[PDB]
Design an enzyme around this catalytic site. Structure first.
Site: not given
Ligand code: AMH
Ligand code: CA
Length: 223
Positions: A177-178, A40, A174-175, A52, A62, A84, A57, A171-172, A54
């Site tokens: 992902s992957g 995705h 947004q951002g 990486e 890097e 996925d 910066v 938890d994980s 920061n």
């Molecule tokens: N809390 C799990 C988390 C997994 C990735 C998802 C995405 O960014 O697509 C958001 C929710």
């Molecule tokens: Ca950097």
């Protein structure tokens, strides 16, 4: 990452940032030429950023390398996020060093209760938005398949697992992902999906990498 901690610069040397003018996903270096991420996260024009801490910066360790090809899993379903997983080839091999290092693939699947390290540059707030710029880390256990399926009835396949805390708070997000879920020195998960972040009874869902090792090895060897 919600409820985690600052990893420390280059302490997760297999963590990469995928950049298309801005950071949009994580990934994991698996050899000098190949990165594993979530399907995705697919888009054209990906630059892989290694070494990486920061992400805003230039700190001196890097390596920025454009992708030459991406390979989405043949059975990826964008509606359900089953399968996925995606491979990204680097146009030139990364120079491997203590801060830019590959993570080993599983030789078998990991058990419920095994502790794992999840990492990324995603949102750190369970309500609202704050992005951290430096890499965040979270120690979290693999949850039982029954607790995972109970949290997301009708949505969990054999290619997914849950990890984290049913009580919420960590938890994980947004951002992230992957990016990687590493357990006992092996890449067992990829940050895939969930409902919100760090909410009660809604743990993160992760692609089950151990089901894909043969596909990964065969695909790399032929590409
Ligand atoms: N809390 C799990 C988390 C997994 C990735 C998802 C995405 O960014 O697509 C958001 C929710
Ligand atoms: Ca950097």
């Amino acid at each position: 990452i919600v409820g985690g901690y600052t990893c420390g610069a280059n302490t997760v040397p297999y963590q990469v940032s995928l950049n298309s003018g801005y950071h949009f996903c994580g990934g994991s270096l698996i050899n000098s030429q190949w990165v594993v991420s979530a399907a995705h996260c697919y888009k054209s024009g990906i630059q892989v950023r290694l070494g990486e801490d920061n992400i805003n910066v230039v700190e001196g360790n890097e390596q920025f390398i454009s992708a030459s090809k991406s390979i989405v899993h043949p059975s990826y379903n964008s509606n359900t996020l089953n399968n996925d997983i995606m491979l990204i080839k680097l146009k030139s091999a990364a120079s491997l060093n203590s801060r830019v290092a590959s993570i080993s693939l599983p030789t078998s699947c990991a058990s419920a209760g095994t502790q794992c390290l999840i990492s990324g540059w995603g949102n750190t707030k369970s309500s609202g938005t704050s992005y951290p710029d430096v890499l965040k880390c979270l120690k979290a256990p693999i949850l039982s398949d029954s607790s995972c399926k109970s949290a997301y009835p009708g949505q969990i396949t054999s290619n997914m697992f849950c990890a984290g805390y049913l009580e919420g708070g960590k938890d994980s997000c947004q951002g992230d992902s992957g990016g990687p879920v590493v357990c006992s020195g092996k890449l067992q998960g990829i940050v895939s999906w969930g409902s919100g972040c760090a909410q009660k009874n809604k743990p993160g869902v992760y692609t089950k990498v151990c089901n894909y090792v043969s596909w990964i090895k065969q695909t790399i060897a032929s590409n």
